[PDB]
């Protein structure tokens, strides 16, 4: 057996994944999650009197509120968010999340 | 056996995936999730008196509210969001999420 | 057995993942999570009288509130957020999260 490799690679694996994003306002509220997953390989070669301009755009997020009025009560009442029971275990009994009786 | 490789590759795998995104406002609210998955390979070669301009556009997100009025109560009442029971386990018994009795 | 490699690679693995992001305001509130996952390989070669400009854009997040008024009570009442029971264990009994009786 002869095993030979040149690994000159670029890898992103399982990146930026399985995020759980919740925004639950009463009112007048902004949530921004800015999560690009970017893999860039750039090999600019410039001889003689050439020019290379490499200026790809980035992400822009703009939120503008010019006027916002709430003239009466802003109220949130949350008993729960996001109840989860995972239980990959073998032989478990009476496993409970958010039990009301 | 002879195994020979040149791995000069670019890979994104399982990136930016399985996000759980919830926006549950009473009112007057913005959620922005900016999540592009971008793989770019660029090999600009510029000889003599050439010019290369490489300026691909980025993402733009703009939200503008010029006027917004709520003249009476803004109210949210949430008993739950997003109840999940996964249970990949073997022989489990009486497994409960969000049980009301 | 002969095993030979050149590992000249760039790797991001499981980066920026499984974040649990919650914004639960009464009102008038901003949450920004800025989490790009970026892998950049750049090999600019510039001979003679060439120019290389390498200026790819970054992320911009702007939130502007010009006027915002709440003229009455802003109230949040939270019994819970995000109850979770994991229990990958063997043979556990009477395992409870957020139990009300």
Author numbering:
A (entry chain B), B (entry chain C), C (entry chain A): 277 to 377
Task: Give me lines lifted from the publication on this model.
The formation of amyloid filaments through templated seeding is believed to underlie the propagation of pathology in most human neurodegenerative diseases. A widely used model system to study this process is to seed amyloid filament formation in cultured cells using human brain extracts. Studying templated seeding in cultured cells, and determining the structures of the resulting filaments, can thus provide insights into the cellular aspects underlying neurodegenerative diseases.
Although the resulting filament structures differed from those of the brain seeds, some degrees of structural templating were observed.
